[PDB]
Amino acid sequence: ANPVWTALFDYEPSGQDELALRKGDRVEVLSRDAAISGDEGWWAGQVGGQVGIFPSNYVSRGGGAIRINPNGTWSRQ
Amino acid sequence: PVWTALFDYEPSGQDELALRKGDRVEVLSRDAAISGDEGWWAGQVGGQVGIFPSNYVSRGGGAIRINPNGTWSRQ
């Protein structure tokens, strides 16, 4: 498998290659690295049988109970 | 205005800023003048000005965060 991230917010595609997200969706992340530099920040993922690109700032790892701090420690929320 | 880096990012181009998760980023422009550069923002990290992907930051460095769907949260 690939890592599974969770959508934080709804996202509505603006084009046909973009993946629609709704809050709480589990997204399998297939690539975090755009081939074209102008697309950096968009990740490829799969949800619901569909594969497309989505903005990385709409997803998180898990549900929020554990936080990774800037200094690399973990905390409970 | 202060933003926070969401992810580590290692740059691979000229003028691009290194990000580490949790960095404070001061955003200078949210709008590339050229169409090829749309999606990249200009800002300053650690005293250095350069560009970075917009989607690798979130707004706010204190108790209130602004999400990209236009909502606000307590951090």
Write down the domain spans for chain B: 1-75
CA distance A54 to A56: 6
Q: Looking at the domain that runs over A1-77, which CATH code has it been given?
A: 2.30.30.40
DSSP A32: S
The method recorded for this entry reads: X-ray
The structure was resolved to a resolution in Å of 1.2
Q: How many CA atoms lie within 13 A of B37 on its CB side?
A: 16
Q: For the CA atoms of B71, B50, A31, A46, what is the dihedral angle to 10 degrees?
A: 20
Q: Please give the single-letter amino acid code of residue B6.
A: L
Nearest CA in chain B to A37: B37
Angstrom distances, CA of residue A77 to CA of A69, A74, B75: 11, 10, 10
Q: Which candidate in A12, A32, A40 is best for mutational testing of the B interface (most B CBs within 10 A)?
A: A40
CATH: 3.40.50.620, 1.20.1090.10, 2.30.30.40, 3.40.50.300. Which one for B1-75?
Answer: 2.30.30.40
Which residue has 């300053």 as its token pair? B44
CB pairs under 8 A between A and B: 49
Q: Which two tokens stand for residue A12?
A: 């509505």
Q: What are phi and psi of A37, to 5 degrees?
A: -55, -35
* Spatial CA neighbour of A23 closest among A10, A36, A11, A12: A10
CA distance A25 to A77: 21
Reduced to 3 states (helix: H, G, I; strand: E, B; else coil), residue B55 is helix
CA distance B26 to A76: 28
Is A57–B39 a contact, with Cβ atoms under 8 angstroms apart? Answer: no
CA distance A72 to B12: 24
Q: Work out the burial of residue A71: count CB atoms within 10 Å of its CB; fewer than 13 is exposed, 13-18 middle, 19 or more buried.
A: exposed
